Design a protein around this ligand. Structure first.
Ligand SMILES: Nc1nc2c(ncn2[C@@H]2O[C@H](COP(=O)(O)OP(=O)(O)OP(O)(O)=S)[C@@H](O)[C@H]2O)c(=O)[nH]1
Ligand SMILES: [Mg+2]
Length: 330
């Protein structure tokens, strides 16, 4: 049914300083990356992208306009690239229906790329690879926010030669790791072979191709079930004190529908916590949940979304705990 439609979850994974947060910043038109403490990503980030915005940002690679969008929206998960946060990467990976694996085209596959590849392989998660930082190709000239193929056609042959050498050795690296990969238009076996999207976080080039590709991951590679809403699933990302709201929880609503006044149960230090959802909040669209700002009050939220819950007795709450809704009787 057209209602009960579900927004899938996409996880961005990659080696440290590969441009994950920067790519998200370019799509969002924000500056989270500069703001980050320690100059690193240390927490899971949630941004919701309405399908309209995706249509906007994919216009250059879909100018006839006959490409089909059957998703209501897409929830996007940013993850830490550092070696230390294996656990956060694992959690994010557990949550996400599809993925973008970011590779620095200059460096190729690196240890955390390998780790992420194991994570994706183990949970059989459909993914595309973003060859980021293509502007670092010597003598690259920019057309802002343009499809990769269009701008690549305009490049000189030094740039094309460097690009195809790096592309070749990245393909050989993937082959060594047990993956057959292809440049996204060159791929004839979408099910078995991984599409590669050259991108620039600074220039925004290749991003429309990437967006349209994760969309096609949702429509073709992802299970049909997850196109539609189902029995509720939610996971606690964070526990924090917010003023006017006391101790609140940042939660990923993976499936189902969350409602205001719902009696919920989640896990705390020494045991279960049963309470009622007094306030159901989201960040503004195209904005991170962890980043503070304004909130939108909801009387219900449909999966998948990043939400903030205000409720009594959430002090003990544990991150990574599942969240359940308790029905009125028996
Ligand atoms: N030239 C160029 N630089 C980029 C590009 N993408 C990211 N960078 C630079 O690389 C650095 C790291 O970017 P960042 O967004 O923090 O990567 P990350 O994957 O999120 O890093 P982390 O979360 O694992 S710590 C930043 O200083 C950014 O300016 C790109 O496409 N082109
Ligand atoms: Mg980051």
């Amino acid at each position: 049914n057209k209602d009960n439609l579900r927004s899938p979850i996409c996880c961005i994974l990659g080696h440290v300083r590969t441009g994950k947060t920067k790519l998200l910043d370019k799509i969002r038109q924000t500056n989270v990356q500069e703001g980050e403490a320690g100059g690193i990503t240390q927490q899971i980030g949630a941004t919701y992208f309405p399908v309209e915005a995706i249509k906007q940002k994919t216009a250059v690679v879909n100018k006839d306009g006959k490409f089909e969008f059957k998703v209501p929206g897409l929830l996007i998960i940013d993850t830490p690239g550092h070696e230390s946060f294996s656990n956060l990467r694992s959690r994010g990976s557990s949550l996400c229906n599809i993925a973008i694996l970011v590779v620095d085209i200059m460096h190729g596959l690196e240890p955390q790329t390998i780790e992420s590849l194991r994570l994706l392989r183990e949970r059989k998660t459909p993914f595309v690879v973003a060859l980021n930082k293509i502007d670092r190709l010597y003598g690259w000239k920019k057309i802002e926010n343009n499809g990769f193929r269009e701008s690549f056609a305009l490049q000189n042959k030094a740039v094309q030669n460097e690009f195809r050498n790096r592309l070749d050795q990245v393909k050989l690296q993937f082959a060594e790791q047990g993956f057959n990969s292809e440049l996204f238009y060159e791929n004839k076996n979408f099910a078995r072979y991984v599409s590669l999207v050259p991108t620039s976080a600074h220039t925004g080039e290749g991003i429309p191709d990437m967006l349209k590709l994760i969309v096609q991951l949702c429509q073709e590679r992802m299970a049909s079930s997850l196109m539609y809403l189902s029995e509720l699933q939610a996971t606690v990302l964070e526990v924090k004190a917010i003023e006017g709201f006391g101790v609140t929880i940042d939660v990923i609503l993976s499936n189902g529908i969350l409602r205001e006044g719902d009696r919920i149960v989640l896990c705390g230090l020494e045991g279960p916590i049963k309470t009622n959802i007094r306030a159901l909040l989201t960040p503004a669209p195209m904005r991170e949940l962890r980043i503070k700002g304004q909130y939108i009050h909801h009387k219900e939220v449909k999966a998948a979304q990043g939400v903030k819950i205000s409720a009594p007795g959430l002090e003990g709450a544990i991150a990574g705990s599942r969240l359940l809704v308790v029905g009125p009787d028996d």
